[PDB]
Each structure stands twice: as C-alpha cells, then as structure tokens.
Design a protein around this ligand. Structure first.
Ligand SMILES: NCCCC[C@H](N)C(=O)OP(=O)(O)OC[C@H]1O[C@@H](n2cnc3c(N)ncnc32)[C@H](O)[C@@H]1O
Ligand SMILES: NCCCC[C@H](N)C(=O)OP(=O)(O)OC[C@H]1O[C@@H](n2cnc3c(N)ncnc32)[C@H](O)[C@@H]1O
Ligand SMILES: [Mg+2]
Ligand SMILES: [Mg+2]
Ligand SMILES: [Mg+2]
Ligand SMILES: [Mg+2]
Lengths: 485, 485
C-alpha cells in the first residue's frame, strides 16, 4: 500500500542527488549491439570460444532484474531486441561505480554497459561489464485490464507477447508492401481530409478549416481518389493508411483504423479473389513460417482456397428454415428481417434488407476464410453491375474468424450509372440514412473521362493482423486503441 | 466553342449505341504487358529479330492518338508504363472490327489490343494488332492552371512530367523505408485522432466523436506517442504519415501533409545530423542516380556535408548590421523584431522573439542544405536542454531551397522538466498563444517510467519530394492538394 509511495519518494530522492552531481539526464552513452544480435551471433558458442574471442560489446536498456550477491551481481537488461545478462562485479568496474552507483540504481532504470561476452555456468550468454552507467532514472517502479491500452508503454515493457504482436504487425505491413510492389502496384497518398467524403457508407468525423472557413470530413475511405488516379493512368495503385468513421468502439472497431485499398485496371473481382488468397498464403508463410494459422480454437489453412458462397447461400446455410422466396419480396424480407431482430429503416430497400439479414444470420459463422459474393446493387453504389442480374453487383467480401476482413469488386466505370446511384444515395440520406453517400460530381466527371475496367479491394489491416497474432480484440493489435474517457 | 459540345454529344451517342448492342462497359479483356515492359525488353531488337521471335502480347490503355490512313491506322496507346504504338489494319483484325468499331472510337477511349511485336520503318516498337477492343468509352475528350490540381487525373493523363514526379514520390518513400529499416528502425502507426494534441506547435483541426460524445483533434504530430513507444522498448521507431494543421495553404503548406518522425534511443542530435545527410545522399544517389541535384537555378550537392550554423550565426550572417547584444535583451529584441516587421505577441519571450527574428532574417536564404542549431528552450518544449547553456536546447532544423525540411533534437527525458515546460506552454496559451501545447499528464507519466536518452527527427516528406523533383510548390508533389472552394 504505502510501499509504492516509498518507492516513488526513494526514486525522487535518488534523482535529487543526481541533480546535485551534475547533469542528471545525460545523452552520451552509445551501444553497438542489441540483445537479439548478441544471441543470434553468440548463443551457439561455449565459454571456451567466447573466452578466446574476447569480444567486447556495448548495450543499453532497462534494468529488469538485479540480484546483488555481495561483490558481484547479476542483471537482466532488456532492450529493443529482448534480454541479455550482465555480470556486474565491484572489481571489474571503475573504483566506486559498483558501490556508489550501481547498488543505488533501481529496477526500471535505463542503464548502459560495456563488457566482454562469456557464458554463465547455466550456459547463458552474459556480458562481464567493465563499464556500467545509469542513463535514465526511472521515477516509477516497473509495472482493470484496460491499463494495457491506457498505458501501452507499460504493457510493452511488461509483456513480451504484446511486443511480439506489434513487431509482427510491422512485419505484416512490410510484407504486404513487398507483396503489392512485387505485383507492380504503386503506393500513393490521397487526402484524409475531404470536402465530400465517400468510398464507403459510414458516419464521418467532421471538422473545420479556419483558413478557408470550410467544413471538412476525415475520410471514411480513399476509394474515390484512388479510382481518379486509375483514370489518370496509375493503373495499379494501393494505399495503406488510416480511415476514420464516427462510429462506436468495439472488439473489431476503432474510430480510426488502417485499411489497404488497391486497384488494378483490366481485372475483375475474380482477380481480387486470387490476390487475396495469395496475399494470405504469402503472409502466413512469410511471417508465421506456415500456412496453417492457429486462431482461438481454430486453425485456418491459408494454403487451401477460401470457401465461397453467394450471400443467399450463406443465409440459407445458416438459417436453413428460411423460405428463400422471402428475399425476393420486400414485405416478406422486411418481416423476415424484423423477425430476427433487425430494425428495418424507412430508407432500406429489398437489397439492403437482404444484406442486413445476411449480416445477422451468417456473418458470425464465417469462421474459416470465406468469400461472400453477389452483393445487392443497393448496398454497392460503386460496384460494377452484374451482366446477368442487374440487381446484384460483381462484389464480394471475405470473412475469417466471423469478422469481415475485406471488401472488393469489379469497379463501376459507367459514369451515367454512377451518377444515378449517387442520386439514390442522396435520396436515401434524405430518407434518413445517415451513412448514405454524398453526391460527388467531380468523381462522376472523372469517370466521364474514362476509367478502365478495374477491380478494387479494401482490406482491414488491423483485423487482418488479429488473425496472424491470435488476437481476439482489435484493441490488441493497435498500439493506442481509442479508449473511453 | 460549340465543337466541344459536339464532341460530348457524339460520345454520348456512340455510348447509346454500345448500350443497344449489349453490355456497354465490359470487364473481360486482360493484358500481359505494359508499354515500359515491352520497351525495356524489345527496344534493342531490330525488325529482323522481332520477326523471327514472333512474340504476341496484350496491352490496354488510353487511345492517345490515331491516324487513319485508309485500310491501316497508327495508334499511340498510353498505359501505366508509358506509350506503345499499335498498327491497326482492316485485314489484320476480325471482319468488321476495323470499320464497324475501331474507326468509331475516340481519342481518350480505353482500348485493349493483342498483336505481334515488330519495329516500324522509323524504328519504333509497335504491335501489329490481331485483336482490338473498346474497353471504356470516354465521354469527355482528352484534356487557370489550377485545373491540374482540381482534376489531377487530367494532369496525369496529359503531362508525363507530372506523372514522373509522383512516380518518383513513390520511389522516394519506398527508399526512405528501405533506408530506415536497414538501420533497424521499425515502422509503427500511432493515433491520428487525439484528445490532447501535441508534439508540435500548431492550430489543430478539431472534430467530435459522437459515440463517446468526445471532442477530439487530428494530430499535428505523432511525437508524444512515438516517444511513449521508446519508453515501451521500441527503441528505433519511425512513422511516415499525415499530420494535420489548421493553418492556411501556401507554396510550402498543405493542411494535411506527410511527415516522417523517427526516434533512436542512445543517440543525440549529432547522430540525427549524420542520418539526415546519409538519407539525402542515399536518396539522391538511389533515386536520381547522382548526388548533385538540380533545383531551380541551384544545384545541391548531397555528396557534401550540409552547412551548419547556430541560429545566431545565421541571423548575423544575413542581417550583418545586427547588434547581436540585442538578442540578449528582451526589449532590444522586441524592438529589433518589430523593426523588421515581426508582430511580437504578448505571450512571446526572448527565445521566441529571437527565433522569429531568425525566421524573418535567415530562413529564406538557406538555399544550400543547412543545419541550424541552438534553438531557444522557449520554442522547444520537448527538446533536451543544452548542458552548458540552459536557455537553448540540443535541437536543430535543416533547410534546403530556403524552406524548413526537418526538425530534430536530443529528446527531453527529464519528466520534471517536461512537466514544467508544459506548464509554460499552458501559460502561453492562456496568454494568447493559440499554438502553445496542451498539458499532457500521461506523457509526463510515461517519462517518469523512464525514457532512454533519445534523438528524434521529423522531416516534411512533401517538402523533401520537391527538392528531388524540381517542384517549386508543394502543390506539385501532393496528388490532391487542398484547393480553395
Ligand atoms: N472498390 C472496392 C472497395 C474498396 C474498399 C471500400 N472502399 C471500403 O471502404 O469497404 P469497407 O467495408 O467500408 O471497409 C474496408 C474494411 O475496413 C475494415 N473496417 C471497417 N470499419 C472498421 C473499423 N471501425 N475498425 C476496424 N476496421 C474497420 C473492415 O475489415 C472492412 O472490410
Ligand atoms: N522530437 C523531434 C521533432 C520531431 C518533429 C516535430 N515533432 C515536428 O512536428 O516538427 P515541425 O517543424 O512542426 O514539423 C516537421 C516538418 O513538417 C513540415 N511541415 C510542417 N507544416 C507543414 C505543412 N503545413 N505542409 C507541409 N509540410 C509541413 C516541415 O518540413 C517541418 O520541418
Ligand atoms: Mg461496419
Ligand atoms: Mg462492408
Ligand atoms: Mg510552419
Ligand atoms: Mg518548426
């Protein structure tokens, strides 16, 4: 109870003393190795080899553990690469350092050491220090379960599993880029501030540009800009960045999240299906070392094709007692939708009701990688219309672990059609749909100049990261998740 | 005048006819080569070689030019890789395609072709088409000078110099990542929505999260979060992404811009100076093929060290008649500052006035790569204090072409100091400074756990891109610059 305040007081007092000696917070010590480097290169060498090699190195990091055994101590130093042992002895360090300094430091203190590599009796790689310094005094001792999110640095200091998750996140993003670039895609940066937000259906965040006394929105999706670039000739473009949606936080939703949108001209959604499957197989193989990924109580084989069902097949499969004819009648569908708990809004049409039914009925059940095709036109204002059935579009979404991971389709490059669909979206917003799209005249204009047949795909990067790190909340894969005040 | 409307009407009529024949906008044609690929691989081969090689390829792109010479025509097809010639002959294509289709198409129309490679009499690489299709009908004919920005797709279709600039932008970003990763830096993604914006001095954009009924700000800088990660153990982190500042548009300012922030523990600003110099030399060499870069009427030698001056030396050098003692007296400095047109705000202190003087006096003159050191503490709330002179911090900024390209310093890891500086910033905001920082208690807390000595650097990526593409307005290096309504 009070022992914590004694720790705080003790640290402030030790700092006070440092301040009296000179500059309390230096910036002079330089290391030449991180723990991981030392282990990779020297773990396989026995004390004999290391003795003759007589290799001196310099490291720096947090003092995680310290066992003072008189004239000698053993310390665990933790740096960006992991942990390495330090052998701190009174007679190995400059006169007085051991007793007048080292013993006065505290766990959590950032220290720097220079010494010779050797292996302990236990066979561990250790550094027999010849120099040791206190670089940063930690004023607080080393660390609900929401603390991990409110103070992610504490979580990173304490849990190696958490660190590994974020390190893997970086590996995945770098691997996606390498994968995309390998396919001739060029990464671009489109606006995140837009006067007319679009490219998706979501409530946007609105802000105001004082200089132009202009109200603007954080983008909910870069889609409309990326397709403008395809019209401009950048036929293989992709963007991996934030998108913002003024919607509530959840185990799969963060107000700001990372999405990858990619567009390749002269391709349709089938090409995107192949790309998605190869992307996941590549990432699993590349990042995890295997195509079979364990997630919760499941195992996803990214080495086998994703399952593929039309939206209706998924509805029928997960609610077998459904009279499929009900999805063809607005009243029947509205009734069905309502019977299962969906509040049917005045603005919704049959296509929207059917999609909502699909959401309620099947989504949570798509545990194994699944592609859901034949999305109704009503809910796909930017998707190419299907040649045989105008009421649906050449669009799909894919799910893994019961969550939507991506959304892709053959793009709508029919300007007149696009204009009309934007009008419907405007009507819908007038009819109450707060997520309906804004009319984007310049976008239509761009299509009038000619957009090559194209296939676009958006993938929720955070959700994707969850599947590769066995995380069951988006909060575990975003360094600083949105937290409630 | 009316000729444009005749073009529009003609295109709509041709489309109408396509609609009558079936699906006007297909998505079926697939290419296997882009123009650049064909040129790289076959430009060096004469018609003899190509004849015997009898290589068939498929391309797709915009019909830029068409010369109908009776039973044969010559077309310039432009795709993501550039341009390639098409030899379109009546008897080389399926019956009727040439006359009933090809001749009816219009420049700007997206077409696809499949044919054998050969070289024209002029020695140009061309494709003797055997199949040719209209993929997308262009309803508008091929394209103030602000149009390039309002309809960047038109600019990209029309000007290859503009395309090359953006292609180079992508190359530069990819090269920065490769450079950073080569140095063990890990790329992270920190929030772009923050309840307490910080890390810089700027008027932020504010928005509202309905779900949490919480007012939030678009980040002006990720600095405070990146340093939290360093405390957490990610000792070499960097982020390259948007930052938003509610400030006016300029030839060097966009409300949203790309900045790279990097932090490496156990390093000081001198280490950042080396990193910056190597980064520019590497990028020039790597991306431009030479370390000497032509920019406007100048040539920057990124193969030679940047010039380095303290802020005062730059002031003295560019306003030689300045009595340097004036910078040591608030009243004298205020007078000096005002005498040169700077409106000195009530909140400003000596350090701020001196910095403003430097800005007015020297900034525009730093044409050749220059590092400006010794920034006053008052204007550097997050920078490590200098050991000898507490009134200045171990901070620098670097300029090229008379514009600030980067800002870096040894980081302030003295929690108590940081808290006090935040208080001063709060006082300043209370005294009228609309750009002063907010107090960030959690940030201070993070520092209390111990931030290793660190050196951080922020570089304006867009401004950097300008120097490598001879662009003289930021508007030329951002695909969709903020435009006035
Ligand atoms: N032209 C083809 C379509 C391209 C993508 C489309 N413009 C688009 O925006 O498509 P959406 O489906 O809107 O979103 C894409 C994916 O983003 C994830 N996602 C969406 N909201 C999210 C949130 N709040 N938190 C975390 N992740 C979230 C999902 O994986 C989604 O599939
Ligand atoms: N701890 C070390 C400091 C790290 C960087 C610091 N947090 C930072 O934010 O530092 P600033 O200096 O605020 O901005 C960095 C660079 O951004 C560019 N810039 C700033 N505003 C811009 C605008 N409106 N348009 C385009 N570019 C702009 C500049 O190159 C600047 O140097
Ligand atoms: Mg959603
Ligand atoms: Mg969706
Ligand atoms: Mg500025
Ligand atoms: Mg600055």
């Amino acid at each position: 109870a009070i022992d914590f305040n004694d720790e705080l007081r003790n640290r402030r007092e030790k700092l006070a003393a440092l301040r009296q000696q000179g500059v309390a917070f230096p910036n002079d010590f330089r290391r030449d190795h991180t723990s991981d480097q030392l282990h990779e290169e020297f773990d396989a060498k026995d004390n004999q080899e290391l003795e003759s090699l007589n290799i001196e190195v310099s490291v720096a990091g947090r003092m995680m553990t310290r066992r003072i055994m008189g004239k000698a101590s053993f310390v665990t130093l933790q740096d960006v690469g992991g942990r390495i042992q330090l052998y701190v002895a009174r007679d190995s360090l400059p006169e007085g350092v051991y007793n007048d300094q080292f013993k006065k430091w505290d766990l959590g203190d950032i220290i720097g050491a220079r010494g010779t590599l050797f292996k302990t009796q236990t066979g561990e790689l250790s550094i027999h220090c010849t120099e040791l310094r206190l670089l940063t005094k930690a004023l607080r001792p080393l660390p609900d379960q929401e603390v991990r999110y409110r103070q992610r640095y504490l979580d990173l200091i304490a849990n190696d599993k958490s660190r590994q998750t974020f390190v893997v996140r970086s590996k995945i993003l770098a691997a996606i880029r390498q994968f995309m670039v390998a396919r001739g895609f060029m990464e671009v940066e489109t606006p995140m501030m837009q006067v007319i937000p679009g490219g998706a259906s979501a409530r946007p965040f609105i802000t105001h540009h004082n200089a132009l006394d202009l109200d603007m929105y954080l983008r909910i999706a870069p889609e409309l800009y990326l397709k403008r670039l395809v019209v401009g000739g950048f036929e293989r473009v992709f963007e991996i960045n934030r998108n913002f949606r003024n919607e509530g936080i959840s185990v799969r939703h963060n107000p700001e999240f990372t999405m990858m949108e990619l567009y390749m001209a002269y391709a349709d959604y089938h090409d995107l299906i192949e790309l998605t499957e190869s992307l996941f197989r590549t990432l699993a193989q590349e990042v995890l070392g295997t195509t079979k990924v364990t997630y919760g109580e499941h195992v996803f084989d990214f080495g086998k094709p994703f399952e593929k069902l039309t939206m209706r097949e998924a509805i029928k499969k997960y609610r077998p007692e459904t009279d499929m004819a009900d999805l063809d009648n607005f009243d029947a569908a509205k009734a069905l939708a309502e019977s299962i708990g969906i509040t049917v809004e005045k603005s919704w049409g049959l296509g929207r009701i059917v999609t909502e039914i699909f959401d309620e009925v099947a989504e949570a059940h798509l545990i194994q990688p699944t592609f859901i095709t034949e999305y109704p036109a009503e809910v796909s204002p930017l998707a190419r219309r299907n040649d045989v059935n105008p009421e649906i579009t050449d669009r799909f979404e894919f799910f893994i672990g019961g969550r939507e991971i991506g959304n892709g389709f053959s793009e709508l490059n029919d300007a007149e059609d696009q204009a009309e669909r934007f009008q419907e979206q405007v009507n819908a917003k007038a009819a109450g749909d707060d997520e309906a799209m804004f009319y984007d005249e310049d976008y239509v204009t761009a299509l009038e100049y000619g957009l090559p047949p194209t296939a676009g795909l958006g993938i929720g990067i955070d959700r994707m990261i969850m599947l590769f790190t066995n995380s069951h909340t988006i909060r575990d894969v975003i360094l600083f998740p949105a937290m409630r005040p």
